Amino acid sequence: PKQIERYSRFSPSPLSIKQFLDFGRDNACEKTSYMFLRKELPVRLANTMREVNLLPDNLLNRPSVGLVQSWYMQSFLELLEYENKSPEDPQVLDNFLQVLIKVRNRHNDVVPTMAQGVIEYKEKFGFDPFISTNIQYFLDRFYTNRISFRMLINQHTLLFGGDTNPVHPKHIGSIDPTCNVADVVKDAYETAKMLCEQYYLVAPELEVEEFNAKAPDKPIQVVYVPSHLFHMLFELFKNSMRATVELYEDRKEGYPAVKTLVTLGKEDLSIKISDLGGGVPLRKIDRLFNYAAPLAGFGYGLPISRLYARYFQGDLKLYSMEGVGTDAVIYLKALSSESFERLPVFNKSAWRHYKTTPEADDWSNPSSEPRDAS
Amino acid sequence: KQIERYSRFSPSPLSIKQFLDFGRDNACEKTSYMFLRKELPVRLANTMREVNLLPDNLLNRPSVGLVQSWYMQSFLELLEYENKSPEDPQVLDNFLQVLIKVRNRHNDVVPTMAQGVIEYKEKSTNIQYFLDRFYTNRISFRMLINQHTLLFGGDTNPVHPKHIGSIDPTCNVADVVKDAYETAKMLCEQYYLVAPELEVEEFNAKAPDKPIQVVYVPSHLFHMLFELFKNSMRATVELYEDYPAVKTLVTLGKEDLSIKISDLGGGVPLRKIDRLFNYMGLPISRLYARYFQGDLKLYSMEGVGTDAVIYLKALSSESFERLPVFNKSAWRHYKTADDWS
Amino acid sequence: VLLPALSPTMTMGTVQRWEKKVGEKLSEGDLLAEIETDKATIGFEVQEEGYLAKILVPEGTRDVPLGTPLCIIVEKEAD
Numbered sequence: 139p140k141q142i143e144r145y146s147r148f149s150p151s152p153l154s155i156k157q158f159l160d161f162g163r164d165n166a167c168e169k170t171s172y173m174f175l176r177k178e179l180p181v182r183l184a185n186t187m188r189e190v191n192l193l194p195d196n197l198l199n200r201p202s203v204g205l206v207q208s209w210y211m212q213s214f215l216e217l218l219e220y221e222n223k224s225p226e227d228p229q230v231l232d233n234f235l236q237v238l239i240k241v242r243n244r245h246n247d248v249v250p251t252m253a254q255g256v257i258e259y260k261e262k263f264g265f266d267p268f269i270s271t272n273i274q275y276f277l278d279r280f281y282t283n284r285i286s287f288r289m290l291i292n293q294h295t296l297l298f299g300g301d302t303n304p305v306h307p308k309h310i311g312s313i314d315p316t317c318n319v320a321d322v323v324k325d326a327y328e329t330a331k332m333l334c335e336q337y338y339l340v341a342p343e344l345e346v347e348e349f350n351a352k353a354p355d356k357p358i359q360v361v362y363v364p365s366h367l368f369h370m371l372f373e374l375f376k377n378s379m380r381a382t383v384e385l386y387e388d389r390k391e392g393y394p395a396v397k398t399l400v401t402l403g404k405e406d407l408s409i410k411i412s413d414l415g416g417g418v419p420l421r422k423i424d425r426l427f428n429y430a431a432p433l434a435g436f437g438y439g440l441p442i443s444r445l446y447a448r449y450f451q452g453d454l455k456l457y458s459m460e461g462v463g464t465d466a467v468i469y470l471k472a473l474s475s476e477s478f479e480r481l482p483v484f485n486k487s488a489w490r491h492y493k494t495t496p497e498a499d500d501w502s503n504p505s506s507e508p509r510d511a512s
Numbered sequence: 513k514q515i516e517r518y519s520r521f522s523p524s525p526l527s528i529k530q531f532l533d534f535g536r537d538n539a540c541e542k543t544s545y546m547f548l549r550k551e552l553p554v555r556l557a558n559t560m561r562e563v564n565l566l567p568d569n570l571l572n573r574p575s576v577g578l579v580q581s582w583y584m585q586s587f588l589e590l591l592e593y594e595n596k597s598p599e600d601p602q603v604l605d606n607f608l609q610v611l612i613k614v615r616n617r618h619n620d621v622v623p624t625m626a627q628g629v630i631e632y633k634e635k636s637t638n639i640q641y642f643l644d645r646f647y648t649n650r651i652s653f654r655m656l657i658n659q660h661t662l663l664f665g666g667d668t669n670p671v672h673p674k675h676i677g678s679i680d681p682t683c684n685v686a687d688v689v690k691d692a693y694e695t696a697k698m699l700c701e702q703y704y705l706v707a708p709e710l711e712v713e714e715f716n717a718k719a720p721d722k723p724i725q726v727v728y729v730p731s732h733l734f735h736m737l738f739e740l741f742k743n744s745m746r747a748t749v750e751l752y753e754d755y756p757a758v759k760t761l762v763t764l765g766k767e768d769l770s771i772k773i774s775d776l777g778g779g780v781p782l783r784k785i786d787r788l789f790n791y792m793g794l795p796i797s798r799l800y801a802r803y804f805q806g807d808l809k810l811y812s813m814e815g816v817g818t819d820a821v822i823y824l825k826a827l828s829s830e831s832f833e834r835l836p837v838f839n840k841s842a843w844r845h846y847k848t849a850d851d852w853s
Numbered sequence: 854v855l856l857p858a859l860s861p862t863m864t865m866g867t868v869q870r871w872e873k874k875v876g877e878k879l880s881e882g883d884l885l886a887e888i889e890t891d892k893a894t895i896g897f898e899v900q901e902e903g904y905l906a907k908i909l910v911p912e913g914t915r916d917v918p919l920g921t922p923l924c925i926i927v928e929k930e931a932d
């Protein structure tokens with residue numbers, strides 16, 4: 139923990155989408171990249187391993203957690219073994235590349251194990267408030283960091299691993315410079331539909347409207363990682379299609395379409411997916427992003443889906459009118475120049491959240507059995 | 513020390529059902545007296561502690577001095593009935609006059625506190641917190657005092673006889689909508705000589721035939737809809753130089769009463785939308801909604817329009833007051849950030 | 854530690870939950886417990902300095918009258 143103490147005290151370094159792009163497009167210099175990553179990757183790692191380290195002792199004790207920590211630690215040290223190796227011989231650079239491969243795979247199953255250590259703690263220790271709001275805090279940051287970690291590695295391997303036949307030939311790493319939002323929407327939909335189709339033999343049609351304020355007829359495109367977006371959309375379509383079928387299943391009107399509206403303004407790219415699934419009480423809407431019918435846990439889940447959005451200064455929000463339907467909205471920055479990575483830093487400000495004792499409520503709270511007036 | 517004593521007391525939340533029951537069945541002016549003479553100075557204490565935890569360069573301000581004393585004033589005037597006997601009708605008449613005096617002292621039509629935060633034009637929005645609680649409490653003051661005066665005021669010609677105080681036990685929301693809109697439209701016509709039309713639709717999930725009703729305080733709901741309707745028209749008109757109707761939808765389900773107002777006024781960027789709630793109007797409307805466990809949300813499609821939505825608890829039993837308690841927690845907010853880039 | 858008058862008209866409350874462990878240190882203000890009178894559910898905060906020696910009214914006890922000895926505090930922590 140001495141090096142871990144030192145690196146953790148460094149602050150991550152976020153990059154705008156523009157920056158990833160201009161870098162793999164203008165520069166394309168594997169020297170600068172190794173230079174940045176041999177520091178940046180072990181930093182983000184140490185700023186994460188530090189937090190998980192401040193979890194409640196019951197949780198930290200789950201074999202799934204100590205397991206995670208060790209994988210993180212190792213990857214940390216294999217990387218730390220470059221603090222001074224120079225980017226001059228293509229021997230170093232070539233071997234860095236390989237390490238990135240290794241750790242990517244090594245970590246491939248971190249999310250799985252993590253989720254396992256938390257559940258194994260829930261149904262083994264306690265339903266209380268503050269402890270649970272804590273874990274929420276931890277996971278948003280834990281996962282977001284993870285998301286960012288792969289983002290950085292993917293850009294380096296795709297850019298310099300030079301795999302002869304690139305799956306996506308126009309892309310810059312994972313970034314689509316000319317991404318058609320309407321297109322990623324139809325695909326996200328097409329596939330949630332196919333699933334629906336197989337498990338319900340039925341499915342709500344899709345409806346799309348674009349409105350480009352910026353330039354009233356040029357289709358709405360953006361600089362983004364297509365796959366990230368696709369996943370958020372799928373998640374939402376899956377949910378609106380489930381809710382719709384389930385309600386109109388015993389009626390006799392067919393299935394109301396699921397409407398989508400994409401808009402591009404001066405600084406917001408907004409996408410809205412509306413459905414008439416019966417809406418949901420406000421009360422439970424909030425719960426949705428926390429960690430007599432079933433059928434299809436396929437996507438990433440709303441929580442992760444939203445991390446993806448928030449990751450590049452965007453957001454995902456749910457609005458519903460209980461009794462009628464729901465409006466799910468994804469917000470993405472119109473400009474890549476404003477699309478900076480949103481990373482969790484391990485500083486004392488973070489420290490406080492894992493070191494707080496329950497407190498009194500800032501506001502009033504009703505009796506469970508109030509005095510009857512009269 | 514008096515203040516200290518009343519501040520350690522925790523505000524007592526009342527639900528719309530309790531408010532409706534008491535003034536419909538009991539309606540005992542003697543009791544209400546007994547309740548209000550203790551509760552009000554309790555609520556006044558808790559707001560006064562926080563105001564006094566305000567960074568001095570603000571507590572300093574002219575407008576703020578004015579306020580701190582004003583609350584003090586009310587706190588004392590109401591404490592002389594600490595142990596006076598309701599038995600003599602005269603005590604009740606004076607008490608009724610004191611309520612009328614504090615109700616005016618703390619009206620929000622005359623922005624004092626707000627302007628005190630303007631003088632701050634001389635010289636990190638932890639100010640947002642305070643005001644939201646500050647104002648929330650005065651919403652309650654008025655709620656408690658209007659109930660009493662409406663029930664025991666002796667006005668032999670109430671505007672709404674079947675009302676219980678300021679509560680309409682069969683509040684036909686659609687009508688409160690038209691009212692809010694018709695007055696907005698009027699304020700409009702006055703500077704634009706024709707405003708966007710109003711389109712309304714309800715859907716009573718609970719019984720699609722019946723028009724949507726609910727036990728609520730019409731005036732409160734009016735302020736919220738007026739404000740929004742106001743904003744939806746201003747935008748629609750300001751954009752469309754030389755109009756797209758304003759659409760409203762009212763829905764009612766098991767738990768929620770949702771009222772949505774939408775305009776095609778070109779929308780707003782997400783970034784700014786938030787700033788529509790810190791005091792840098794719409795913030796009070798939302799306090800009104802949250803006061804009885806409801807809420808007000810805004811969401812826009814920058815480049816197209818806006819969706820303002822009001823959520824109210826469909827059951828009087830679950831419409832409790834949400835009051836600002838002063839304790840350690842409350843205290844912490846006045847002595848202190850980012851762990852994200 | 855006596856059960857106090859948390860609201861003007863109060864007479865008796867109910868110890869909903871204890872938020873401090875017997876042995877733990879008590880700083881002027883720390884949330885000590887959850888008391889649910891019939892007016893509201895209140896978070897009872899510590900008044901004096903001290904250490905939780907022991908509790909006298911178990912978690913969940915209902916209708917506890919005013920003045921009821923809730924629990925005992927002790928100055929130094931060797932008791």
Ligand SMILES: *C(=O)CCCC[C@@H](S)CCS
Nearest residue numbers: 509511530531534547659
């Ligand atoms: C406790 O005192 C029970 C509250 C009942 C009286 C309230 S509803 C007064 C109406 S102002």
